[PDB]
Design a protein around this ligand. Structure first.
Ligand SMILES: CC(C)(C)c1ccc(N(C(=O)c2c[nH]cn2)[C@@H](C(=O)NC2CCCCC2)c2cccnc2)cc1
Ligand SMILES: CC(C)(C)c1ccc(N(C(=O)c2c[nH]cn2)[C@@H](C(=O)NC2CCCCC2)c2cccnc2)cc1
Lengths: 299, 299
């Protein structure tokens, strides 16, 4: 049972290189618009406290070099929507898929197509942390890489990568340019909140374990949501809601283990540890699989 | 630091559905040939001890339904190469990429494009175990899914999925139809050998840990290859060769830690365990990252 990403083909045909002066990063080319982080227009003397409106005034269309594979797209307009730059180009991307722009919820997962110089390099599955960071694998110049989900034939873009925090986690925006979390595209001290564990996701992964025959942690007990949440909050776990219980229903039905029964199992795992046993080959509780992810991978 | 797969777009345009009677699985459509496991021509009364030559004699071109997305390809010929069926169709795939067929080495990794009914569902990174099994995430009907690597603009196909063993690991062939390992496409008792740990890959992952700031396991000591291998063999680790040392050179140079110094660190980790510490967020030693994988993800 593995971290599984969505096939990336629909996204690969949209990645382009965007250069502004000495700075190169990635852009997303949909119809006749290229989306990319606005901090591409920054210089090192601007990065500490940029005035992006003023910086964008100083730019002309010819200060933006956009390359698709190895064809130069002509920028014919440029504008700023919150923290994303929109570069209007004179050609529509013929490989534009059907798409929507979505803002996701903490705890939800998505696939990341990690790119450098406009070229895809890898694909992996990510979760949006409760504190709106992502624990990504991104090097310098990965800015403009996007996170996405696929539903039927439609790509739902939910994340554009912007920056690393000095703690090594990553921050970015939705495709309308609004940051996830309290972060800003400037080189200043920025703390993420305390990170917590996504309780509903750990429960889904214990169900995945049961589905795959790892059952040693099941116990006879049950619990109430209220008494579970009282314990969970001592171990830095997000509260479990009735909506979360309803969301776990399919996994409960497939295994015949009630949600509050699995909650009792998670409660004793927290209070006792694993005693050197593993679950699904891990010695830690995994929280980056949603209930949907588990159902898809096990159905 | 994550399990990262290659972008899958070049492979997605090659996946088709292949039905023979009640059996549906996946095929790979390259130029005017569809490759798929030959056991698609089996019935339940054939599965225990199939005579594939005789079974293929009984088939006609019209017993093979091949669907690309939702277009029916006309099979105009059929033949068997070891354990893969080659269905000649009357159209060339216009999305055929540049490709080669390669047979990989135990310990090497590849990306898997997991498919059902000819449609991509997910992509993940895999390793070929020392005993020529793969620990994949494959459900029923995943047969015909392929594993691949990308070099420059060329897809190197190395694996076609065939079957699950009752132990839950997976077996398959190269794209010329030769099984990896001692396995056969028949429903009989088949044991994989004892599985061992890919030593050079664990060393690469400790380097990845050092590159990412996890350094607690470094010690002052060094060792010889011979004395390392004497210990390693007690813990079910593959022998480390001079070729493996040379392969680890770039990682040694980037970190300034000699290979035999890291070998001394791995030797004490084996003899002492981790004392509840983790490395790269794992409490177990990870062996499915090659030195190449680490260099790519950290460069
Ligand atoms: C101008 C602004 C907003 C401060 C900025 C500066 C640099 C970048 N980083 C580019 O690599 C990069 C930038 N432009 C082209 N490449 C990197 C980045 O975030 N370092 C941060 C380090 C802490 C202090 C602030 C910046 C980066 C590294 C690894 C993974 N992701 C991104 C992103 C934003
Ligand atoms: C005919 C032959 C060679 C014995 C065979 C039979 C079934 C399949 N399996 C198909 O799912 C399938 C077959 N044809 C269409 N779908 C599955 C499979 O291997 N069960 C094995 C279980 C142990 C005993 C032998 C078969 C499968 C499940 C999960 C992931 N991977 C494959 C593969 C090969």
């Amino acid at each position: 049972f593995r971290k599984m990403a969505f096939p990336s083909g629909k996204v690969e045909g949209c990645m382009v290189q965007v250069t502004c002066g000495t700075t190169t990063l990635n852009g997303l080319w949909l119809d006749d618009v290229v989306y990319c982080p606005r901090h591409v227009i920054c210089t090192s003397e601007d990065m500490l406290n940029p005035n992006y409106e003023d910086l964008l005034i100083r730019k002309s269309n010819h200060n933006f070099l956009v390359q698709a594979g190895n064809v130069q797209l002509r920028v014919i307009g440029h504008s700023m929507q919150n923290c994303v730059l929109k570069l209007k180009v004179d050609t529509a991307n013929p490989k534009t898929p059907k798409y929507k722009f979505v803002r996701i919820q903490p705890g939800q997962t998505f696939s990341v197509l990690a790119c450098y110089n406009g070229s895809p390099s890898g694909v992996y599955q990510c979760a949006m942390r409760p504190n709106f960071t992502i624990k990504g694998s991104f090097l310098n110049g990965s800015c403009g890489s996007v996170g996405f989900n696929i539903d039927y034939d439609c790509v739902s873009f939910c994340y554009m990568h912007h920056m690393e925090l000095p703690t090594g986690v990553h921050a970015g925006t939705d495709l309308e340019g609004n940051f996830y979390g309290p972060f800003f595209d400037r080189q200043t001290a920025q703390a993420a909140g305390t990170d917590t564990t996504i309780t509903v996701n750990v429960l889904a992964w214990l169900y995945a374990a049961v589905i795959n025959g790892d059952r040693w942690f099941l116990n006879r007990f049950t619990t109430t949501l209220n008494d579970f949440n009282l314990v969970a909050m001592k171990y830095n776990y997000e509260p479990l809601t009735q909506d979360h219980v309803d969301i776990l229903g399919p996994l409960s039905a497939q295994t015949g283990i009630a949600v509050l029964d699995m909650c009792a199992s998670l409660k004793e795992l927290l209070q006792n540890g694993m005693n050197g046993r593993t679950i699904l080959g891990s010695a830690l509780l995994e929280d980056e699989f949603t209930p949907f992810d588990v159902v898809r991978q096990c159905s």
